[PDB]
């Protein structure tokens, strides 16, 4: 009845944020405000194929009044490209959003199993110690030596006596701290060597023993 008009974007600006990276469990909303005569329809694709609400647990909400799609409680399987298609007898336009669902590790550093491995070596030989760490918030690594001041190895607070041997700081490198290297190992260099990895959430530690002979 009215002069035909191919679909167009009613609010381009509100569309520039192409990449949507959000932490898991959050709620994502993609909007493609458009118009045209006859009045255009709207449908969504996900990684190429049609996107029906049966494709994700709990489906999703579409509010055509706002040309939007809404997904509550994002999960890893929601990762992908989301494309809206606006179509009427006289045309088609589309926009594609990239949804990335990030999982966080709000935990203390996880230390690799095994490392640092215990040891008993021969004098004068140069011995290493590898400590490998997984941590979301940037971790900080420090190597310690289980001191034996007086006769006790356990201090007055039930915490084992130690001495800081190597600390991470600007320089070194994430990979230089990953290892504690000894020189002409002696006798007194006998004991337990501990790697301490700590982040803004907590601290984790692994030990290894080294006897001299």
């Amino acid at each position: 009845n009215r002069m035909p008009v191919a679909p167009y974007w009613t609010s381009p600006e509100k569309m520039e944020k192409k990449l949507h990276a959000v932490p898991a469990a959050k709620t994502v909303k993609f909007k493609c405000p458009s118009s045209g005569t006859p009045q255009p329809t709207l449908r969504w694709l996900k990684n190429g194929k049609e996107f029906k609400p049966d494709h994700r647990i709990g489906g999703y909400k579409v509010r055509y009044a706002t040309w939007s799609i809404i997904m509550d409680s994002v999960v890893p399987s929601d990762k992908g490209n989301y494309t809206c298609i606006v179509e009427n007898e006289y045309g088609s336009i589309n926009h594609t959003y990239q949804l990335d669902v990030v999982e966080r590790s709000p935990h203390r550093p996880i230390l690799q199993a095994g490392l640092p491995a215990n040891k008993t070596v021969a004098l004068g030989s140069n011995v290493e110690f590898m400590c490998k760490v997984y941590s979301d918030p940037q971790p900080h690594i420090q190597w310690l030596k289980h001191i034996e001041v007086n006769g006790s190895k356990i201090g007055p607070d039930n915490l084992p006596y130690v001495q800081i041997l190597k600390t991470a700081g600007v320089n070194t490198t994430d990979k230089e701290m990953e290892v504690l290297h000894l020189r002409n190992v002696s006798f007194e260099d006998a004991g337990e060597y501990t790697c301490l990895a700590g982040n803004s959430i907590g601290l984790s530690h692994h030990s290894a023993w080294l006897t001299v002979l």
């Binding site: 990449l19 990030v102 966080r104 997984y134 900080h140 600007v170 601290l203």
Partner: protein, 133 residues
């Protein structure tokens, strides 16, 4: 993924990647192919980090005005307290200006949001650590 590997700091606002420009300017961008958004983070202490470009090797810093620039040599204005908030985003507050509670932030357009005008309730301070690819 691996704290030693580079990452991109994605702002929740305009959905920008934090970018340090050779001229020492730091803004935002969606150009996930840029070479000045790749950041390497290092901790001086538990929870205290440095952020720097793996291209210009500049360190992200914030002056007494609240401006984020690319410093060639680290220093106090180069330290930030990294925090994983409860909403699961990362905030970065100036170590030097911790009290003034200045956060690292980007406006919606993708430009530095001078620490002073930054607030904890805000959305420009919220960053998501992303992989390069």
């Amino acid at each position: 993924g691996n704290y030693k590997k580079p990452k991109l700091l994605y702002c929740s606002n305009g959905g920008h990647f934090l970018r340090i420009l050779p001229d020492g300017t730091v803004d935002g961008t969606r150009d996930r192919s840029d070479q000045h958004i790749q950041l390497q983070l290092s901790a001086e202490s538990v929870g205290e980090v440095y952020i720097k470009s793996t291209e210009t090797g500049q360190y992200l810093a914030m002056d007494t005005d609240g401006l984020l620039y690319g410093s060639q040599t680290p220093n106090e204005e180069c330290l930030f307290l990294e925090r994983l908030e409860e909403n699961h985003y990362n905030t970065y507050i100036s170590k030097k200006h911790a009290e003034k509670n200045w956060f690292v932030g980007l406006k919606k357009n993708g430009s530095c949001k001078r620490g002073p005008r930054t607030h904890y309730g805000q959305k420009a301070i919220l960053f998501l650590p992303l992989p390069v690819s």
